[PDB]
Amino acid sequence: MDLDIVQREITEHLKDVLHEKAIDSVDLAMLAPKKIDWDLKRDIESKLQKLERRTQKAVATIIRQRLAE
């Protein structure tokens, strides 16, 4: 029987994450590799890009009517 099927999927945790030895280094990324907004910003992007494309479309109409005169 495939008595351990869950282990096939969590392997990326088991290999690199279930154990780690040590570190002795520092850098400006390692001090703060992400910022506390990041997941909230992530989930806005698919909506906020629609606004961005509308902004380029909107600004094109503003220009077009401002040069129509």
């Binding site: 850098d27 001090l31 703060a32």
Partner: protein, 69 residues
């Protein structure tokens, strides 16, 4: 059997202080990696590596003695 509670002094570089440090660091890093050049790049320093060199030089530090006894 029994163990003391872990008590630690407050960090010298507090979290609010580190926020400022990473703000300056990311800006200074970005404006380096922004741009290179074919001959006039020798005006620039490779700041981030010099900062690493400075940090390992500053890594030796010691508590002062003889303030009392």
């Amino acid at each position: 059997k029994k163990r003391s509670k872990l008590v630690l002094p407050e960090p010298q570089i507090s979290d609010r202080e580190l926020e400022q440090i990473v703000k300056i660091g990311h800006a200074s890093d970005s404006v380096r990696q922004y741009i290179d050049g074919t001959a006039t790049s020798g005006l620039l320093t490779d700041y981030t590596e010099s900062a690493r060199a400075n940090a390992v030089a500053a890594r030796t530090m010691r508590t002062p003695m003889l303030k009392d006894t």
